[model samples]
Target: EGVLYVGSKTKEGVVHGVTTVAEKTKEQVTNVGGAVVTGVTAVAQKTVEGAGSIAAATGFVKKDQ
Candidate 1:
């Protein structure tokens, strides 16, 4: 076996971009409605994350806080 090695570079001196990947898996089971189809899964975790970003604008949290 082997590993995947990634590398990068940039100019103006130097710079690098860091990124990540993840997939969310969820299934809802109910005996009521039957068939399933797909577009995408919208997770509640993203909504919970944005809940506080507004407070930074309202000054409930500071730029440095």
Candidate 2:
């Protein structure tokens, strides 16, 4: 699960329009294999990317698995 907190009132030119957001409810492998990337909604796909990156390594994974 995720949480986003925000507020807005004033609007400006070159406006920032942030509306859609998501939470990846499934594992990345499940997401990638269970359906087509093209078939998935953009917000869900973005959430998949975000969730997948949450554990990005400071170093790297090894060959040993």
Candidate 3:
């Protein structure tokens, strides 16, 4: 068991997205598959230089991933 990390980029408009919940390791292939892209949520940042004021699963790509 360990801490896995995925990141967001308010600087690229790829906010609040989901990815493969991968567990290709030595311990065990735990929690490794499903809709790895769990569900999209909002990661709103009204301060990013390129990101717009779009909300929810509307404009953000990852936000709807």
Candidate 4:
């Protein structure tokens, strides 16, 4: 009975530890993913605007009336 109690306690501890670490890792991963996605979108929009401006200045794209 004593040995069985020790085994059960160890299993519970391992499971709890894994759960905590997995939760923290999931949060960090999502945070990083969001930041990366935002940064990429911002950069892409800026690039498109800059290209449009250049095209307009060069008279390649005409302005609307």
TM-score of each: 0.15, 0.21, 0.19, 0.11
What lDDT does model 2 reach?
A: 0.37
Model 2, C-alpha of 25: deviation from truth (Å): 45
Question: Where in model 1 is the C-alpha error above 4 Å?
Answer: 12-65
Candidate 4, 20-61: lDDT as tens digits: 235435333212211232221122212233443433223144
Candidate 2 lDDT over 1-65, as tens digits, reads 76755454445434332333458753322222232333112223233444444533233334866
Which has the better lDDT: candidate 1, or candidate 3?
A: 3
Cα lDDT tens digits, model 1, 1-65, are: 43555444434343233333445844422232222332232112223254545422221333764
Greater-TM-score candidate between 1 and 2: 2
Flag the better candidate by lDDT, 1 or 4: 1
Name every residue pair that clashes in candidate 3.
none
Q: Which prediction has more favorable lDDT, 2 or 4?
A: 2
**Relative to the unseen true structure, what is the C-alpha lDDT of residue 49 in candidate 4, on a scale of 0 to 100?**
35
Q: Candidate 3, which segments miss by more than 4 Å at Cα?
A: 14-33, 36-65
Q: Which pairs of residues collide in model 1?
A: none
Q: What is the lDDT of residue 11 in candidate 3?
A: 43
Q: Which lDDT values do the candidates have, in the order given?
A: 0.34, 0.37, 0.39, 0.26
Q: Report the error of model 2 at residue 14, Å.
A: 5.0
Residue 65 displacement in candidate 4 (angstroms): 63
**Candidate that scores best on TM-score:** 2
How many steric overlaps does candidate 1 have? 0
